[PDB]
Write a protein that binds this ligand. Structure first.
Ligand code: FAD
Ligand code: ZN
Ligand code: ZN
Ligand code: ZN
Lengths: 99, 98, 26, 113, 737, 85, 12, 99, 80, 105, 96
DNA sequence: ATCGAGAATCCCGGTGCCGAGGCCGCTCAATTGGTCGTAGACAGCTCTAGCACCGCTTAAACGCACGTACGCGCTGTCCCCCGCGTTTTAACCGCCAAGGGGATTACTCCCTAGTCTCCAGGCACGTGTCAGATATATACATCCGAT
DNA sequence: ATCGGATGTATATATCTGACACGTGCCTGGAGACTAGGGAGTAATCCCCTTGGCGGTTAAAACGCGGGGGACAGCGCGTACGTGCGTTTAAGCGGTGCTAGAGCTGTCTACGACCAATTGAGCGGCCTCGGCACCGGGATTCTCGAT
């Protein structure tokens, strides 16, 4: 008798897990290739220490995570429970991100 | 393998000593020790810089303990300022009594 | 009337439910 | 003709456990003032000892209260972010391997009976 | 400074400060401004500033109060509000009978109910001889209230705990304040679905605005007093609630408390007349009458001593009104008739179930009597002849379909008028056939038989075969808020309530009324044996069937409009059988359920004992009760009691096929259908009919002839409760005159 | 090489990876165009951070970006990050 | 809204 | 003959053209000055102010309040509302990190 | 008396008009006086801290331009 | 006039004093105040230029701080250099959100 | 007795104004705003020179550190022309 | 309305293993002890600029009526995104190779603090206009009914 | 959907008046010409730590497929706040007075750099085992589909 819990049990339970855990999410080699690719524009043929790639990973996840905190408060303040891109644009504008 | 390295510094044995003072039978991990190290450096350049321009405003050229008392009363929020000033005066006077 | 039923009450055919929305409410 | 005269250092002199000489050298060698006074890093080492004792204290309380015997940086995350004033001193500071203290908005919690 | 008051039209020729809070208080002298609370109460600009200004000593006390008043109320915390709520001296009335002077208490004294209950002048010479403060008389000038700045807000109202969901100042209580029968829920809670006999704490009802128009602008004072009165009644429903009992519970500062005390009596009598309090089986005797002598001069003849007649008689009698009840039979009760001869149990031949106990008059009366009811459980297995309990999935499948049929009926009727009405049964049938046609689905014979059970249950409810009942109007009454909560078995029987209502009333048995003449100065009533009665007013509560038969001669005759309404309703019928056994043979299979269902072998037989009721909730005695409804009522009219008993026993031996069933040792079979003065069980709407019929039948004629009975209650038809309430309704109408 | 082509230049932050970061942030339901904009915002943030970091690596005339480089350049943008120096 | 009204207080 | 009046919003939008257009200081100087002194009495007593410092705190008051209505207005517009409400003030204060 | 209330309801209206706010709800003014009160409490606290350190009884304008600079709200037009 | 030794109009010696007397390094090289003076003359030059055209648009001859307000806030880059800086007697640019514009027929 | 003084940039700001739109004047509040503006940028760039020299174990602020610190503060286009004018003034200085 | 699969989550138990903690040499930065110009507490004046006070006009603030439009709750209707099996597929991991570039230590040397005097650049200080606010009268631009 | 009061707003013209651009004087900080120790460019090397490749497994990513609930447009109904007019009312002004304290300048003095010998103290190398993972098994709890 297959029966999925619902739209929200995987969500809220998985929010409890991925808030509860500590480790770094987005994978090492695609992120590393990303930083090298953006790095090629300002200067050719760079080199990275590995821990610096972990550092850009950590600040990048913390900045995105804080952005989803705030855009979540944005869309909840519209009596919605779903992030939509104009909410992202709002928090980037409200915070001051929007140049 | 057999060659001189490069003298280095830290705060880690001091943070370990205050850990022995507060909860004496309790460990600490290594990256947390480097967190506290960078914390002590961060606060240290905060009140050091506040002492710099706070001493620059009054046409002085000397950092004394009144300046550090003011600058701690600028960065430390409230209840955190007061016990910092009580421990500070206790350490100035407790130093000076010798 | 439906209201006479105790055992095995019928449920179908009921008008929509109205809900008092007063302002005096905290 | 002697430079002994009981060696009382500096740290003890004040009754602390922070390096007055190392902090003192770091105040003279960052170009903060051309002259640096007599008892300034005594005062400043006192302030940093209080702050260190506060954060390590709350990570100790949270360290028992999440069933370990060793402070990890996660306990520094929710150790710092639970006091109001320590959070206000460190509100622009990310600490690595910290994660997020568990916050759930009220509309996300289920609308059960 | 000045000696004059800010308020325009204030008759205070010498303002004095009641506060004396500032060390600078002006007292009876000059001040920059006198602030007005009422015609007799002012405070000087110094004491005003004492609280209002940040640099004054009373500012703390005013800001703290201003905070509580914020986390708790919806009115603005003004200094005048703070004054009326916090500083105004209390007033209390001397209880010495020959004094009754109102006295101002010193500003430090906090008035309590106990203080008010026993207070006499001087309570800290003849203190009672000191003249009453001249300001007291002023309060009873209609313009006095008009020049009150803010409405009274009661403190520690008995109603408070029942209203924690409302802003206290929206229901006449003060934001700065702070084991009842679970069936007493007199106040609507915010965001509640309708339920019967509920009032809004924050809004006046239509009849209330009618009686007290002076409160349409600001109902605050009324609501507080009405809510308090109801709370007090439900707190103790075993005693008459009097003004004396209420007054001590009216706690508010200022002369306004005098105006509140003066109003409570008016509201109390209105509540009593309408039947909201001081009602049920409460009995009151000579020199205890519940309404002033002003209502007493009048007389009434009540025809019929069932729940409706006895309700009105009880009410009118308690009011102090002269009442005589004429009953046709050799017993009171009507369709309430209990058999007390069964071993250890009371079995109703008529009514015995209470449908929705919350706010039900019957629940109140059980409280007054110290009677406990049994709440029915939900389980009711559908047992087949012979033995098989119906599969849970088959059960759920057919319940769903049955109710789906009702949905589409309710959809079909939306645009139909009375002139296009079709029988519920026929409509259901058609919709059913047209569904099997549409969707190739085909139900088993059993599935069809289970559907028949549900149909039978509708017929029981209406007291009629479904081909007689209106598709448009069968459930008309649910347009109105119905009685919520438990359905119960009145184990002691309705007769205990009946007895209690009738006790000490002037009731004439074996006095069938035949003629009612209201063409002269007063009503002439004549019985079948020629005995004459007369009174100013007459109330008829005879069953619908008897009105339809025209057993009473009316002069002048009832209107054509009334006759059409009378005939548009059906005199519904069911009969009951009760059976006593040597032992509880059904316990194994039934497992403690209050009842069990009987799946019909055929549509024709569906109303023949569809449900069996275990008549001992203690599971000790062995009495079963069952019902005969729909078509089966007819099939039994030529059978004697023994034959009906035989068919019931044959049915039981089928339902319990795989076991033995003992012989019954005692039984009854009812014949309400052929009881000459009753001839029915309960009304329903016949095809072509409207719920409005209940209202039309209910309509008095020239304020001289009144009607009550279950068939006159549009909100609550059919029931003892409904009949009871129709009597209370008519008693109120009659007493108003 | 067995497949493993570019397919996605700056799209490494797979759709479930942005889901995982959002669910660390406490986000229940994510719309459809969120992912492309999320790649854009992350791209702008990394462009500023390593534009500033590569200048610190250029001033020492060194060809290898270190950890102190990016922690210092994060500090300057008011996003200070401990745990590396 | 006739639905909710108290039965004994809507007899006008 | 007696109407003339305007819509609720013409005086508003023309008023936005005027008060966005002009520049001068527009909270009155003596109530503001008494406000700064009364807030100032709590930390230390018996004070003295230069006048231009009271001008300077007036500039910080107008800058911080006015910018807070910028972000509050974008907050309420992002709810498809053209009228600001106190929860929007609370939202922009949490987004800027003012708790 | 009532220094805070001295911030008039039309003044909060006027600052909203400069901000580009069309319509203002009911309890905006209470919270507006509260927010202005908090901001002036922090700025004045830091300015007094800047003024007690020079041991001077008079607060100047350079005091509070410094105090606004340190809170990341720098304001030109008064020096420094 | 080391400005004339470099072709500028900024005080190399006064700026050089201000680099030496703020305790930044222990010692300050030769070419540095020439460099910093050149940068500040550039920034000063275009900010006064945009206040120049945006001063002529108000048909005046004297630049008031309103002209520095919108002169900064109109260009992107000068705004991003000064995005945390209040200007006294500045006001705002005429920003109007488009939903507030009264539409009709 | 007279009184002390205190320098400004107002004559120099006036001179660059005479370079750009020469027949167009300046008011005093805007003059003091420009004054504190160039003190603000001066302390940002000198401060960044301090934080940048304080990493490479160096205790000397030459022009190259001001080049890097300008290439961190000023965004993009005016960083390009700013640094290009800086090379114009170093090279225009030393070639004399 | 209230009760069972059953699946995720939490509670002990041996294992391992390795990273946390500790111990032994050991360079060097703290330390101690004198000097020394000087920055700065400290006294006293001064005068000036902040605070206090009083009367007059009045723009601005306050307060009452009023109406409509803005907020907001209900209703339906669609679809986009959540959830879960199925494939694949590329990330992770171990190890092996090569050297380019970071860190080190030394070498040499130009260069930027440091001194003393010399003078004009800017900066304090009168000064008198031409740019702008302020009426002041005057013809457009768009709003708002009423048609 | 057009037309007209009307009405707030843009357009010359004087007019005082004063804030700014400017001329006089001065004095001190910019500068100019030396020296000197040291910070740093510059070479070369050590090696290590970043990059690269290659194979083996596979957790994660991709993708297809239900399906339902969440966004959102309509829509009715209340209320609250914008608009405008009479009342007040204290803010601005504008002068007048008084002296407390910013600021100046001088007095005298206790205190931080300069060296410079002396040493244990924190730090790196190098062990070593106990706490956290970590399967591994097992009872609890919560959810979700039933009554
Ligand atoms: C078998 C059965 C089961 C029922 N089940 C329930 C139930 O479970 N729950 C429930 O609430 N209700 C039930 N009812 C209905 C309930 O009993 C009635 O609704 C209620 O009794 C009707 O009240 P009444 O006062 O109007 O009339 P009645 O009870 O009918 O009494 C009318 C009185 O009028 C008298 N009368 C008639 N004609 C004359 C005359 N000419 N002169 C003088 N007197 C006259 C009659 O004798 C009778 O005394 C049941 C009824 C029956 C018969
Ligand atoms: Zn008084
Ligand atoms: Zn009065
Ligand atoms: Zn008495």
């Amino acid at each position: 008798k297959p029966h999925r819990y619902r739209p929200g049990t995987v969500a809220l339970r998985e929010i409890r897990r991925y808030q509860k855990s500590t480790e770094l999410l987005i994978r090492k080699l695609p992120f590393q290739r990303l930083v090298r690719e953006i790095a090629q524009d300002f200067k050719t043929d760079l080199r990275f220490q590995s821990s610096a790639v972990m550092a850009l990973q950590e600040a990048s996840e913390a900045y995105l995570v804080a952005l989803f905190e705030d855009t979540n408060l944005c869309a909840i303040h519209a009596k919605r429970v779903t992030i939509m891109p104009k909410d992202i644009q709002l928090a980037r504008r409200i915070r001051g991100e929007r140049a | 393998k057999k060659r001189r390295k490069t003298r280095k510094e830290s705060y880690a044995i001091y943070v370990y000593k205050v850990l022995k003072q507060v909860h004496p039978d309790t460990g600490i991990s290594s990256k947390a020790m480097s967190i506290m190290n960078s914390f002590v450096n961060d606060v240290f350049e905060r009140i050091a810089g506040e002492a710099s321009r706070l001493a620059h405003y009054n046409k002085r050229s000397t950092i004394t303990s009144r300046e550090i008392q003011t600058a701690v009363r600028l960065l430390l929020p409230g209840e955190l300022a007061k016990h910092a000033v009580s421990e500070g005066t206790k350490a100035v006077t407790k130093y000076t009594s010798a | 009337a439906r209201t006479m039923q105790t055992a095995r009450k019928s449920t179908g055919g009921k008008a929509p439910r109205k809900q008092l929305a007063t302002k005096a409410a905290r | 003709g002697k430079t002994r005269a009981k060696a009382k250092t500096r740290s003890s002199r004040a009754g602390l456990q922070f390096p007055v000489g190392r902090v003192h050298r770091l105040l003279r060698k960052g170009n903060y003032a051309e002259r640096v006074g007599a008892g300034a890093p005594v005062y400043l080492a006192a302030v940093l000892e209080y702050l260190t004792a506060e954060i390590l204290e709350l990570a100790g309380n949270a360290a028992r209260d999440n069933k370990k015997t060793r402070i990890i940086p996660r306990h520094l995350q929710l150790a710092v972010r639970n006091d109001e004033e320590l959070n206000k001193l460190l509100g622009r500071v990310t600490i690595a391997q910290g994660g997020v203290l568990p916050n759930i908005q009220s509309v996300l919690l289920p609308k059960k009976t | 400074g000045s000696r004059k008051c800010e308020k325009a039209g204030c008759t205070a020729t010498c303002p004095v400060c009641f506060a004396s809070a500032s060390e600078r208080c002006a007292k009876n002298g000059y001040t920059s401004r006198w602030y007005h609370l009422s015609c007799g109460e002012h405070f000087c600009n110094e004491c005003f500033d004492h609280y209002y200004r940040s640099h004054k000593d009373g500012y703390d006390k005013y800001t703290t109060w201003k905070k509580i008043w914020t986390s708790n109320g919806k009115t603005e915390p003004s200094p005048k509000a703070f004054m009326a709520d916090q500083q105004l001296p209390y007033w209390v009335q001397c209880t010495k009978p020959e004094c009754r002077k109102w006295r101002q208490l010193t500003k430090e004294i906090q008035l309590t109910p106990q203080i008010a209950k026993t207070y006499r002048c001087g309570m800290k010479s003849d203190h009672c001889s000191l003249p009453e403060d001249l300001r007291v008389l002023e309060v009873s000038n209609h313009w006095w209230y008009s020049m009150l700045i803010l409405p009274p807000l009661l403190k520690d109202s008995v109603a408070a705990p029942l209203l924690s969901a409302y802003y206290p100042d929206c229901v006449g209580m003060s934001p700065s304040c702070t084991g009842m029968n679970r069936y007493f829920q007199p106040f609507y809670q915010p965001n509640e679905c309708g339920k019967a006999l509920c009032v809004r704490p924050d809004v006046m009802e239509l009849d209330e605005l009618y009686e007290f128009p002076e409160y349409s602008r600001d109902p605050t004072m009324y609501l507080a007093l009405r809510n308090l009165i109801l709370a007090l009644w439900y707190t103790n429903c075993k005693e008459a609630l009097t003004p004396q009992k209420c007054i001590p519970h009216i706690i508010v500062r200022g002369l306004v408390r005098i105006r509140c005390v003066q109003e409570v009596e008016r509201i109390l009598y209105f509540m009593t007349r309408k039947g909201l309090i001081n009602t049920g089986v409460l009995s009151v005797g000579a020199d205890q009458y519940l309404l002033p002598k002003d209502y007493h001069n009048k007389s009434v003849i009540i025809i019929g001593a069932g729940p409706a007649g006895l309700a009105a008689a009880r009410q009118l009698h308690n009011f102090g009104i002269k009442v005589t009840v004429l009953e046709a039979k050799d017993r009171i009760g009507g369709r309430v008739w209990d058999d007390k001869s069964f071993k250890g149990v009371t079995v109703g031949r008529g009514a015995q179930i209470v449908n929705g106990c919350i706010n039900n008059p019957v629940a109140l009366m059980c409280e007054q009597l110290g009677i406990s009811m049994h709440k029915f459980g939900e389980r009711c297995d559908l047992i087949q002849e012979g033995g098989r309990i119906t599969d849970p999935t088959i059960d759920k499948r057919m319940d769903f379909h049955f109710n789906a049929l009702l949905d589409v009926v309710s959809e079909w009727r939306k645009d139909k008028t009375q002139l296009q009405d079709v029988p519920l049964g026929e409509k259901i049938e058609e919709i059913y056939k047209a569904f099997i046609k549409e969707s190739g689905i085909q139900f088993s014979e059993l599935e069809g038989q289970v559907l028949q059970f549900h149909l039978s249950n509708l017929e029981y409810a209406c007291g009629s075969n479904l081909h007689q009942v209106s598709a448009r109007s069968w459930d008309h009454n649910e347009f109105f808020a119905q009685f919520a909560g438990d359905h119960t078995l009145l184990t002691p029987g309705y007769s205990v309530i009946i007895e209690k209502l009738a006790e000490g009333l002037d009731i004439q048995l074996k006095s069938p009324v035949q003629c009612i003449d209201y063409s002269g100065d007063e009503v002439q009533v004549t019985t079948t044996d020629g005995t004459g009665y007369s009174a100013q007013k007459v109330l008829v509560t005879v069953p619908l069937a008897l009105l339809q038969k025209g057993a009473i001669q009316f002069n002048p005759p009832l209107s054509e409009k009334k006759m059409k309404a009378i005939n548009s309703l059906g005199a519904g019928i069911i009969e009951k059988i009760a059976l006593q056994f040597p032992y509880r043979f059904w316990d194994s299979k039934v497992q403690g359920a209050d009842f069990f269902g009987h799946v019909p072998p055929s549509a024709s037989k569906r109303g023949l004992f569809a449900v069996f009721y275990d008549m001992d909730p203690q599971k000790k005695h062995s009495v079963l009760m069952s019902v005969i409804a729909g078509e089966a009522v007819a099939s039994v009219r030529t059978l004697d009691d023994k034959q009906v008993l035989q068919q019931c026993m044959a049915t039981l031996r089928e339902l319990f096929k795989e076991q033995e069933v003992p012989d019954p040792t005692k039984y009854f079979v009812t014949r309400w259908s052929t009881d000459p003065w009753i001839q029915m069980a309960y009304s329903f709407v016949k095809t072509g009919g409207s719920g409005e019929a209940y209202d039309i039948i209910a309509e008095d004629i020239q304020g001289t002839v009144f009607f009550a009975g279950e068939a006159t209650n549009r909100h609550f038809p059919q029931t003892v409760t409904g009949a009871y309430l129709s009597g209370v309704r008519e008693a109120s109408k009659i007493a108003a005159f | 090489r067995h497949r493993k082509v570019l397919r996605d230049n700056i799209q490494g932050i797979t759709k479930p990876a942005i889901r995982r970061l959002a669910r660390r942030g406490g986000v229940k339901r994510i719309s459809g165009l969120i992912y492309e904009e999320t790649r854009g915002v992350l791209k702008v943030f990394l462009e500023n951070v390593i534009r500033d970091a590569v200048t610190y690596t250029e001033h020492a005339k060194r060809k290898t970006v270190t950890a102190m480089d990016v922690v210092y350049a994060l500090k300057r943008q008011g996003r200070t990050l401990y745990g590396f120096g | 809204d006739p639905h909710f009204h108290h039965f004994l207080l809507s007899q006008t």
